[model samples]
Target: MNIFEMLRIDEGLRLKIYKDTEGYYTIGIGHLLTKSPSLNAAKSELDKAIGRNTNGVITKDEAEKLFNQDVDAAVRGILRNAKLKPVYDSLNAVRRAALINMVFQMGETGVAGFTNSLRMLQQKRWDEAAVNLAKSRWYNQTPNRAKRVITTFRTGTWDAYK
Candidate 1:
């Protein structure tokens, strides 16, 4: 599928978007959607889509089947666009993958704010990019996401992810 097409929202995904955007972070048909990274909740959502709830502690294992396609789709969209290329091209595959994960998590708008991070990567300031990634509002404001992306860039691996 094309990048945009890959993220196509069905009724279930639409509900996720609506609940997240309009329903104000609520879980399970009305509970407040805690922005915190709870494996239970993430798995819960995945289960809702997958038609089974293992209530697994590993969000990746719980949500992997459900989110992998979405994550890949979102990342493809991030990489396909010209605006994302400057950052994508300069960084190593791992750093680029980190940005792609950020794009997957927060949408392009969120990753777009990594101005200093992008510039640092562009300049080949590897450590500085880590610092920038950790210090930005992206990190301070969203610790979980920051951890996920930073770990990827630092280790050159998507394996540390959330």
Candidate 2:
């Protein structure tokens, strides 16, 4: 198996917020609960994970860094699938970013299961793809974030998201 595939198995992907085996509040791909590291370098890497909260967690900038790191991994994992590569490559930056975000949340295989949406995107059918994205379990659970993603995909703009 590939490195990311191994990482996927080792890290795991949890949709809901839950405590890890260590009883620490963790969520989404082994994002450890506390985001404070003693050394600055350690904290920097913690910043690359997340501490999304009001506590002495990482800053918004740190969260963005973490997001970028996560997205890069997502891209590598998704692009490994030949069928998805062309569709992924055909998208604009905003749509591609949204796809990578989704991939981070849903995992590459989970995102790939959105065959119709990916097909619509590959077919350059924006409206259809937007609808397909909206009418999903992801959307049902996270409507606000979903709307932002759908808007980004349909309009091909990051204005609403930013």
Candidate 3:
């Protein structure tokens, strides 16, 4: 499966604005509106994309566009990290998706801070990498998703898609 399909299931789609687990104003497949320059800027972009003034709603197409943009940024962020580039390049599609998914949830900097886990991954020590990930606050904050990601990392499979 594609990364977009996997993310749609893991992140879930939202046509209307809702508060995320962190209580941030989010929309369109976990797009953090609060992360925008301003709420007004976010709304303006949403309205422009959907071709209408949606107070707090968007179409699936519009959502998909936003999701694509976010994924692009995540991928770029992953590639830009010198330490991660080699490891990321050595991984297969499934493992790559797991990395991108993590970067999507947390920023590139956040993922880069996983020094032990990244080292394990770089060494192809899958179990050790998974173990390191499991010990993080990110895992505790979203255990279910994190568990799936860890499994994918350890197994180098599409376990998360299941």
Candidate 4:
């Protein structure tokens, strides 16, 4: 499956406002809206994206548009990180997708914090990278998704794709 398809399954699609595992108000395939400081601000941003006073509801097309933008942002964020760009560039397609998937969920800074893991990945030490990832709080917070990502990292395959 393609990266977007893999992400769609992993992130899941939501048409309306809902609290994520961390209680942040998120919408439309994990697009975090609560980062704006107030619910009103978040709702306004969502409305702007949908081009309507959506009352927290977004159409599938609008959601997909937001999802695409979010994915693009994640990709750019990964590429923009000075420390991560070379590591990302050195990875194979499948491993690259796995890294993108991580950035998609946690943002570039979050992924970059995995210093040892990134180093292991850069050195093509797949098992070590996976082990480091498994030791993170990210693994405890979302075991299943973390397992899948770590598996992809170790195996360099889409076997973890849902």
What is each predicted model's overall lDDT from 0 to 1?
0.56, 0.64, 0.85, 0.89
Clashes of 3: 0
The sequence of per-residue lDDT tens digits that candidate 4 reaches over residues 42-95 is 788778777789998888888899999999999999889998899999999998
- Tens digit of per-residue lDDT, candidate 2, span 37-131: 33344334443455433333544455445445675777898789776688879987667777766776567888878888989998889998998
Model 2 stretches with alpha carbons more than 4 Å out: 1-68
The true-versus-predicted C-alpha distance at residue 96 of model 1, in Å, is 2.7
Backbone-clash count (model 1): 3
Worst 10 residues of 1 by lDDT: 3-12
Writing each residue's lDDT as its tens digit, candidate 1 over 26-91 gives 332222324545645655664565566444222334333445555666667776766677778777
Clashes of each: 3, 0, 0, 0
* TM-score comparison, 1 vs 4, better candidate: 4
Backbone clashes in model 3, listed as residue pairs: none
Best by lDDT: 4
TM-scores vs. true structure, each candidate = 0.54, 0.61, 0.89, 0.94
- Mind sharing the TM-score for model 4? 0.94
TM-score winner: 4
Alpha-carbon runs more than 4 Å astray in model 4: 36-38
Better of 1 and 2 by lDDT: 2
**Tens digits of per-residue lDDT for model 3 on 80-161?**
9986777799888889999998999888888888988988887889988888899999999889989988998899888567
Model 1, residue 129: C-alpha shift (Å): 1.3
